[PDB]
Amino acid sequence: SGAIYVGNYRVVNRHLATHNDWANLVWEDSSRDLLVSSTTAQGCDTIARCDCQTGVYYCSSRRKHYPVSFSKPSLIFVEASEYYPARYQSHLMLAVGHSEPGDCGGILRCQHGVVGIVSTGGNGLVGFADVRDLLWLDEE
């Protein structure tokens, strides 16, 4: 699990989104596994506006932050799991690194801030749902 908190917004994997998230929705996309919901108290997080391919992610199935090189956000085939079938997820970034389903929500950060959250992976890969193209998060 895990979320970002850019102001009074909560950014989560679309598949871990709660009833409250859907009952206080802002925007959502199944192909990306992203959903943003409203909050009453503000958050502690800046979103990266950049093309970095280096950063650090949190991996819950190891209790560690790992430094990684990561690919640019693209359309990637990801194998089956408890939450989705074997499909293409868009705006996915692979790094080489350990990941399992429950690692979803872990933050990837670079010098420019929060880059994205863990969304896909397998076979020593990890895909981060990029948030960097979502320029509207910074305001309103």
Which residues are annotated as part of the binding site?
Answer: 50, 52, 110, 112
Region 48-67 residues binding Zn ion, contact defined as CB under 5 A: 48, 50, 52
Phi/psi for 61 (5° steps) reads -75, 0
112 binds Zn ion (CB under 5 A): yes
- What residues does 64 pair with on adjacent strands? 59
Partner whose footprint covers residue 99, from ligand A1BQ3, Zn ion, none (CB < 5 to 8 Å by kind): ligand A1BQ3
94 binds ligand A1BQ3 (CB under 6 A): no
- The question of whether 45 is a catalytic residue gets the answer no
Phi/psi for 51 (5° steps) reads -120, 25
Residue 47 CA to residue 36 CA, distance in Å, equals 14
Which residues are the active-site residues?
Answer: 15, 33, 104
